[PDB]
Design a protein around this ligand. Sequence first.
Ligand code: A1IK6
Ligand code: A1IK6
Lengths: 259, 261
Amino acid sequence: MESADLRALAKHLYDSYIKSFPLTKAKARAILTGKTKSPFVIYDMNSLMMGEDKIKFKHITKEVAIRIFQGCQFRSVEAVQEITEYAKSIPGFVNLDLNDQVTLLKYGVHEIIYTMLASLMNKDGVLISEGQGFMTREFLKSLRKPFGDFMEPKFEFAVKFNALELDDSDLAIFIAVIILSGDRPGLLNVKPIEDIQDNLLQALELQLKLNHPESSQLFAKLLQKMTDLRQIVTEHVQLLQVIKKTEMSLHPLLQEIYK
Amino acid sequence: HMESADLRALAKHLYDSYIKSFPLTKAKARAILTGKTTDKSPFVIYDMNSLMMGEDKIKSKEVAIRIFQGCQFRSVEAVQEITEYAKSIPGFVNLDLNDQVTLLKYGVHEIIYTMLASLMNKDGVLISEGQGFMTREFLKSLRKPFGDFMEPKFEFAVKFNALELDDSDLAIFIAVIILSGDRPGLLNVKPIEDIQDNLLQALELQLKLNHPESSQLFAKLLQKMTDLRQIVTEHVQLLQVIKKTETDMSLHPLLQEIYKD
Ligand SMILES: CCOC(=O)c1cccc(COc2cc(C(=O)O)ccc2-c2nn(C(=O)c3c(Cl)cccc3C(F)(F)F)c3ccc(Cl)cc23)c1
Ligand SMILES: CCOC(=O)c1cccc(COc2cc(C(=O)O)ccc2-c2nn(C(=O)c3c(Cl)cccc3C(F)(F)F)c3ccc(Cl)cc23)c1
């Protein structure tokens, strides 16, 4: 592809990405750094109870660790729809076989949710409620039984990923590359998916050299993270399934929403 | 950063050392596998009877155990060849000695898988310096847990070999794997990353020059490189589970130490 076509693709994806996701990394970073109403901070039990009285979350119907976990699930379901809408803007995606569209999204959303959650995180906590809240890492890590160990790996990944210092225009292409993975199980027509991903990879490569000219082999470093995400996600799903098997107790309708 | 001439010089150095370090190259393996030559033809082992004839021609335990000891013996040799290759990588021996060990400990299995693919096609694997060829089917039909222990090596190889890398490409790729700064327990990550950045630069240019019509081959090769991470952990887990049931299995101390934590 010609460079002009690659920059057109990068800007097209950036524009759609800004429209698709409520809180961008740039805005999140402004909140986390203090360069912008202070968000309400949840740092222990009492501040959690006050936060759900002030913020009034949508997942509120239980134990504290459960309530937080269910807040995470509720937001992930929201993210899945935001990512699904974003995919439609990826040139060529909507022309793929409908089953392959479903397959790509089915196996991709988890890696993208992990990736984009890093935009909302620093080493000390995570932005919530479209940035109105900030729940500290220590409080999330100290949750009982497997919940503490379920939260901390997200921060562990985010701290390393954020050292790459990607911005939103970088992430918009990177997220598209993840979606267009030709090795997802059960794909019917791999060829056009790789054809698009090859185009996205060229655009990402050019974007990173222009946007980060002093960042050596950042392209290579980002690709390694992308396939790290594979196993991080499979570990996530294992814990996620063990959590439901050991704790759930949900209305079956709720189970289907979260299935 | 490095200038192109320096990057090509690094590529040629690595290829020279690789040829000096690894006795059976992919180029020779493919010459044997492709055939159309009378002098290099392997004896093919495809069942019990041919295994007995092969062990007489090629030169008292269960069959699956005997094959396993053949694999580990050769993996131990591979560790030795990989260790010798690493020392030739500019900067490696200058690193903290603990980090040298750590890099080798976590790197050799990913490299063995990579280089085992050179010896494989979809129907089997070259053995005994290419004098033999054992079919995939025969390996897959081994009893107990051994049959399923063998097949994933072929599964990786068929996909990896689709990239059509040659030895000069592989020499650099193998070097990139060794110089991974994210191995657990490394003491000084920064100088390892500095070397890897030079190796990644060299790999990128090598793949563009050697495979100009291969779209984003650099990116595809990097994706394989981090798949090997889990492919290896599945191997190691299986090997530990197998070892608990099979007493007739003894691991070489070199391998035993590699798998400890
Ligand atoms: C007072 C009540 O507190 C809260 O409501 C609360 C508490 C802490 C954090 C959050 C917000 O969380 C997220 C936001 C976003 C976003 O805004 O883009 C994306 C992801 C998460 C998030 N998912 N998750 C998962 O486990 C997960 C993931 Cl990664 C992928 C797929 C499915 C799931 C899940 F199983 F959950 F379904 C997290 C684990 C830890 C943390 Cl810290 C955040 C997340 C809200
Ligand atoms: C009757 C006589 O038969 C034989 O002598 C015999 C039979 C079959 C295959 C082989 C050759 O095998 C290898 C050769 C090389 C090489 O030449 O570079 C590298 C690797 C292998 C090889 N390791 N392996 C492992 O399991 C393994 C691995 Cl990957 C890494 C570390 C430790 C081990 C192990 F546990 F073994 F300790 C294989 C599994 C399947 C296959 Cl197909 C090949 C290999 C020789």
